[PDB]
Subunit: 497 residues, 3 copies
Amino acid sequence: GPTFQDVASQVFGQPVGPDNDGTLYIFGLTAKYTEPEYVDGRGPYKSFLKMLPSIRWYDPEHYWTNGSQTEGVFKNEECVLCHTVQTPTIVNDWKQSSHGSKDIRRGIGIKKDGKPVEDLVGCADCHGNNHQKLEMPTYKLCNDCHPKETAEHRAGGLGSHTHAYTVNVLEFSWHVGKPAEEVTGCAHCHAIAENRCSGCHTRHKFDPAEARKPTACRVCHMGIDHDEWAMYNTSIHGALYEAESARMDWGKKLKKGNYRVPTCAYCHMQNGDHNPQRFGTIYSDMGMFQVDRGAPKHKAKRDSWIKLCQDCHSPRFAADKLKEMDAGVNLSFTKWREAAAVIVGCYLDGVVDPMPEGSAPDWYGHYTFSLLPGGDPRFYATSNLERLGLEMICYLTGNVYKAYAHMSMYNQTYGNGSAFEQDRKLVEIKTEAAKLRRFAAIEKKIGLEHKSADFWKHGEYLDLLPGWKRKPGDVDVEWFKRTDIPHRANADAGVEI
Amino acid sequence: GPTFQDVASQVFGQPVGPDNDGTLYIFGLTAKYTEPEYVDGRGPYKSFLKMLPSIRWYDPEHYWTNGSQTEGVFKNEECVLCHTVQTPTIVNDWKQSSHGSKDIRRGIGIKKDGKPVEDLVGCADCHGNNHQKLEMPTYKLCNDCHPKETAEHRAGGLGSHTHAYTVNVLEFSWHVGKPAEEVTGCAHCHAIAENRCSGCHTRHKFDPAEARKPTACRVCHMGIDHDEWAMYNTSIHGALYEAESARMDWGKKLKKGNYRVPTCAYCHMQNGDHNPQRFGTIYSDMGMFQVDRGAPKHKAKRDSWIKLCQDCHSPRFAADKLKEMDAGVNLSFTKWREAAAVIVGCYLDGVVDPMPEGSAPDWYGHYTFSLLPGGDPRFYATSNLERLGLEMICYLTGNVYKAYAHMSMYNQTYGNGSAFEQDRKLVEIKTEAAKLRRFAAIEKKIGLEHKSADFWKHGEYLDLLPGWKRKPGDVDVEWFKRTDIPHRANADAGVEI
Amino acid sequence: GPTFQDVASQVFGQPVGPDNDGTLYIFGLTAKYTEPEYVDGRGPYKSFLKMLPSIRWYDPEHYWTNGSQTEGVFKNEECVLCHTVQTPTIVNDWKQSSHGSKDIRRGIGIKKDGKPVEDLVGCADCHGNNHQKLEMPTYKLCNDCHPKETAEHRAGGLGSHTHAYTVNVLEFSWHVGKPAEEVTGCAHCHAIAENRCSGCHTRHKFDPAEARKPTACRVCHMGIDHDEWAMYNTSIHGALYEAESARMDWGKKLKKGNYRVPTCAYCHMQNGDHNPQRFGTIYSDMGMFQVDRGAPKHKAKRDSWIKLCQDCHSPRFAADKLKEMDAGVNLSFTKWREAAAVIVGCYLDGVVDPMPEGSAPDWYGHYTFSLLPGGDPRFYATSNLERLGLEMICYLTGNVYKAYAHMSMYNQTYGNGSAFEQDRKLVEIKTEAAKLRRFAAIEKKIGLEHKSADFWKHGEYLDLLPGWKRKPGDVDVEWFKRTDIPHRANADAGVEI
Ligand code: HEC
Ligand code: HEC
Ligand code: HEC
Ligand code: HEC
Ligand code: HEC
Ligand code: HEC
Ligand code: HEC
Ligand code: HEC
Ligand code: HEC
Ligand code: HEC
Ligand code: HEC
Ligand code: HEC
């Protein structure tokens, strides 16, 4: 019996075929999905988690292998001579780095194995001398000569660069719940933050001045679920950054009195601290958890922030601005709690369409409401009501905090992730709930037995989801028993975390 | 009987508590809203309008009080010596300002009380000498020495910087209709524009070159309801600004022949005019009111714009571009009028869900349709149909004008605030109306008496709204009787404006 | 019988009048639409296609006429002397161009009619000497002296600058289907790309260094249907561009080793090639057509891209990144095919509201489902289901490709045009389909004969659409018979293309 592709083929006169064969498929209609080559993912869901093979660059300790065609054992200078031709910009970068140029060194006292590093740190020093045994480093290499910065980079808790990949990719519902090729960018964004030292000061220049700029953060620290770049950019600080970036001195260390305009790094890597999370009052799951940072119990952290602001402001002004945040955040949660009551009420009254049993199982293998304890809050493969709910708490409520934290007058109120966007989302949620309730009331009165449509449960994409193949004993709970890393409180973790 | 918080508490094992106590509330579910400390707002709705106390910085004439812990009467140089340590960037800014550095003065002839100002204008000159009686200035201070710029800053009409706060915060429906902490950024954005001289050339450098850049405007002149920054930025002018900003001479006055690339200030503060509103053809409520700026009655203003463009263009080309605006704007209103007919038709047929009596009262205390005379057009605490209507007229239709005015080919057509966004919004409006009509038709036929859900009327946020507490005699109509400021035509103004 | 305007007039106390008379119409409610002055459009739909007269600047060969008031025959230097006063920036630009300044010439060997061009190329050389017979050039002028660049500019296929206007304005459904003043920016954006040489290096400086910057492309290469600027900008390449733009050497030709940071022009105008389309693997209708660019048949193009990336990367790394694109793209089409099945299923079951006969005819004059062969896929004047479908394939699916092509980790996954936006759009589509099916099921059971509302078919804007006036013989099929340009496969082309 014909598939969608089969029928499309009969209509468009293009044969059905595999997506991967190079055919230009008209609106992709007659193409069949082919699973890409995978490698096994790590972590507690290693029984089914996959990665694309290009994970080799980002978790090289577990995936890196020789894939070079060039043979030989070479000295540093030979690496440079050939790569001047073969990858010129890498050499140009390296020649403009302190590693490759003594002229710009600052005599900071770098040591390896207790001995001063006075030579060039060349290609072979970081990648190995044998071209068939090249190394793809992590912070572990950098630790050899930069232990202070590495220790700090490794000092964060859950929600920091430190466990971005190990915990918050490998344990994370939205990542583990999707086909690997859909979420490659998630693995890499989070893995760059954790495993590398090049997220802010990029290879191969490794220039701290570059790392001080907002461009060192905004590729990752952006978007609908954590819009801090946009919040910063739409503050007067951000406008002044844009106004002054071209002519200001970026060569100054991030210290009181060295900058007129504060950047991400100025406020979050104060005095060059490589554990930027630590200045935060408390981890709040991106502002989805409500906390009044101006409460007496958080006075030390609030006072610290006020003192940071006092580099360039009255501390009274700074205190007032952070109180505005506290107040704005508290007001924002009234709208979320309204939304949550409406949404859960629909579920409890059994009027959500689809109900959980009418959707594909969640990534746990459960037919459980996403906005209930044990559920999987999400924006995909779920009801419209649940999607809107997730958007309310994650995209909007969380970002109200970010808007206030970063002094974006517009995004606190009108703009993306604002009070007024919350208002509109709340209307949408109530609209969905109202529709659901009216349909159910009508169907009950006329004795129409409504069944949710099959497209909520099955489809070309839905059928790929891991929920379908979850089975008892498929969780590596020993991973969750580990105490050397934090963990996410997943429903099927099976142990104490 | 249990509240949402109570039930959540029983499920999540986290006690109910006040939002402000510092507890990290899981999804904010068990937190209770606590009203922040307020001060009374000013204006015609002073009987219930509130502000957060941090309004002290932005309407200091009515709210500023001593809040310093430092005592003493100091000379200018003493301010500097201590603040070099205590707020270094303020001192650094000031030292780089003409106020604090004679070397960059231009001999413009500044006078105070008819006498030339030849000395430094120091911290104490602007803030006072007594640290327990420090002053937080407005344009009134600046007027002492810069009467021309101040007079112009104070010469605008409604819709200008001049009355941004006094009228368009204190009289404005969306501001007065919401809890104060929700709209702090509104008060401050508008108050910075009105009461300060630092919106464009920031303190403490007060650098006109900074004020010439689009960064001097875009923090405020952005977003879904007035997207002129995005419109400018997505024009060739805006692209050239980005291309040339780093190397161009920003030290030149905004005059014909001094710039290749026009900025906001170039076109709207022509020849340094500090009443930027005046170059506009006519105030149109952000493009929500339809006016053909190319009509004979507006020839003087159109000719003036053409002559401005002629700094760098054929006047025929400029005339053609502004005619494109006129035509594009006129076409855009056909879609709004379509939407309005659909929406009002739903109300007149009584098929909106909720109907106004099913929602919380509007900020006037009325159960009145928002898109009818006397109603309160809005995006919050209203029906989905009404929300979509407001979005159509304000977010989209108004911004089509901005897209054309600023030569954004993309945003005129495809992009944010465009013709095609209007198209999609119109489909959405018709979709909502269609759903409403189908439900009503079904319910009528089967004799189901539909009542709008209680969540349209009551909820944790909805219950905070001022509409609930409005009562006869709660408007200060004497404020509206004032002829020394313009006014908004509010439904409960009670007098002639 | 009263129109909307008539009724509004009785309520607001503002007379009905033509939109163009200069009246400030309250919410545009009582204004009547007046058709702007048009000129006839060119192309196969010339029988009804219109343009605003300002098309004169963009298709000057067919529309340019004298419109100057200045008389005289002048020498180059006289043009300059007067225009120094009359249009100073044009002269300033020209004086800073190689055309107007021998000092910055590079001796490249420019010839006209086989003879070296050693003089200044002045205003009169490009525009003519007679001020009543001034010329408005296209690439045809530039060809006189820059044949190589012009030939390349003219070497592209469909989907390139080369036919942007001639084919993809004049034959394009969304353009020909709308009133001319609505889509002026479409005509001009596409005409600037095709007919001019100033899209990237603007007049009158014609500076290649400017053309190398992303600002040379992003005014056009942006937005919801082709967001490559945003994709680039949210890649590490884009962040580094922003970090380095102010201080980097933009005077270097776009060659291996000359740049650390790649721009649009670096990758798509490799070695100064003025046919940027040619580096693309295959034209895929902006990613709406599915093709695996990593398939064996595309090896040459894939290898070429890998070698380009190898300017600054391992070719293995580059190969891996482009494989990530292939995989991400293939996954993205599963969601589109899901959506398409749901949407077409609704049509085949006759439950779309409106059905095509309930909407205004499409621009062909047909009452045909937009997402069926022969239909007109669109976001306007169609059902909500069809609008959402178009958004899914065009705005989202197409941009997933762009997100991967440009290394935007965030926009591949979370952001604009991402996997997760596809997820949410798919929920929306299923939500619309579910609603449609539930209404139809209820109406069938209770014997309610539902007719789609008249507002789907008629309205102030809908009534302006060309579909209403289409008639047999109104297509210039001789245009489509042309073999010297490619064509769009329009339903009423009437001949082989
Ligand atoms: C240590 C200080 C390094 C030196 C010296 C050089 N490289 Fe490097 N390189 C380094 C790291 C830590 C990484 C991993 C990625 C990251 O950002 O952390 C890399 C990566 C590469 C790659 C692959 C990535 C790519 O862009 O293709 C190549 C091909 C590479 N490095 C080559 C290279 C050459 C030729 C060098 C000498 C001129 C060189 N590297 C210096 C760390 C270090
Ligand atoms: C100082 C003026 C800041 C600048 C510049 C930027 N941010 Fe910030 N950030 C700042 C504050 C006062 C806060 C609230 C912290 C508190 O505990 O009160 C934040 C918050 C964040 C967060 C969340 C941190 C947390 O929840 O603990 C992030 C991830 C963040 N900021 C990132 C960030 C980026 C990327 C910035 C540049 C674009 C940036 N911040 C600017 C202070 C300041
Ligand atoms: C962004 C979050 C960063 C990450 C991740 C890493 N570094 Fe960094 N680094 C960053 C900034 C903003 C600065 C300048 C800080 C300042 O005070 O101005 C730096 C600086 C360094 C330095 C120079 C130290 C010195 O004594 O001058 C080194 C040696 C350094 N960084 C190393 C380093 C290592 C080893 C990292 C991984 C563990 C690493 N950095 C990550 C920003 C960021
Ligand atoms: C960079 C381009 C990112 C991509 C892609 C993904 N996310 Fe992310 N993540 C990013 C940042 C900067 C932040 C921190 C914001 C803050 O205020 O802390 C986040 C955080 C989330 C977290 C925490 C969510 C929580 O418990 O509240 C997790 C678990 C997470 N990110 C994982 C993750 C994965 C795997 C993604 C794809 C499925 C997703 N992120 C996209 C930026 C990066
Ligand atoms: C007049 C020309 C001024 C001089 C000289 C100095 N300041 Fe000022 N300051 C001025 C104004 C008009 C304002 C109000 C805010 C605005 O933008 O209009 C301020 C503000 C302050 C503040 C509070 C705001 C903050 O950022 O914390 C402080 C603490 C302050 N000013 C201090 C200060 C010092 C120490 C000065 C001498 C070095 C100084 N100001 C000069 C106007 C003027
Ligand atoms: C000249 C090339 C301009 C530049 C640069 C910017 N704007 Fe503009 N603006 C311009 C015109 C011709 C118009 C239409 C005015 C008319 O009467 O025809 C506008 C409109 C505005 C408005 C609305 C003004 C009104 O309705 O009276 C605002 C608020 C505005 N522009 C702001 C603005 C900003 C913030 C800009 C930089 C980002 C900017 N404009 C650029 C001309 C030009
Ligand atoms: C943005 C809307 C501004 C506001 C609000 C204020 N100023 Fe301004 N100022 C602005 C610009 C763009 C410029 C340069 C204009 C030009 O022609 O290039 C200026 C300049 C000044 C100057 C210098 C005047 C001179 O003779 O050189 C002064 C003294 C000045 N501005 C003062 C001033 C005052 C007192 C303000 C509040 C009343 C004020 N400015 C507001 C932009 C803007
Ligand atoms: C700066 C960050 C703003 C915030 C926050 C708010 N608005 Fe605003 N306002 C802003 C600008 C630049 C404009 C002018 C746009 C133009 O084309 O004129 C506006 C204008 C509105 C107006 C006029 C609306 C009308 O009658 O048509 C008012 C009444 C208004 N703004 C008030 C207001 C308040 C109080 C806000 C929160 C409730 C809101 N604005 C956000 C920019 C600033
Ligand atoms: C050829 C190399 C040129 C020279 C020398 C000058 N101009 Fe030009 N101009 C040229 C072209 C190809 C165009 C069409 C637009 C495009 O971008 O392709 C133009 C346009 C104009 C216009 C109208 C457009 C406008 O911005 O108003 C004018 C008024 C104009 N040009 C005037 C002008 C003057 C005075 C010149 C000498 C100083 C001059 N141009 C030089 C190409 C060329
Ligand atoms: C190199 C690092 C690039 C930069 C910088 C930019 N783009 Fe790109 N683009 C690049 C690749 C590898 C691809 C995929 C091509 C393939 O066949 O695999 C693309 C794609 C595009 C397209 C579509 C081309 C097509 O489908 O044939 C466009 C229109 C495009 N890119 C434009 C563009 C712009 C405007 C950029 C700057 C903002 C830009 N690209 C950057 C490589 C690179
Ligand atoms: C963007 C897509 C462009 C369009 C359209 C046109 N040009 Fe261009 N041009 C562009 C770039 C990025 C560059 C620099 C390329 C490099 O290798 O760095 C150029 C350069 C030129 C030159 C200089 C050639 C030389 O020998 O140095 C010329 C003479 C030139 N361009 C002419 C030209 C003409 C005639 C065009 C229309 C047919 C044209 N360009 C369009 C970018 C773009
Ligand atoms: C510049 C400001 C644009 C506007 C306005 C319009 N479009 Fe466009 N068009 C633009 C670009 C950069 C691209 C290329 C993207 C790529 O990846 O190739 C497009 C492409 C479309 C195409 C092809 C659609 C197809 O068959 O798949 C056409 C037909 C098209 N553009 C036409 C067109 C018209 C006439 C518009 C208004 C109705 C529309 N575009 C807006 C950028 C420009």
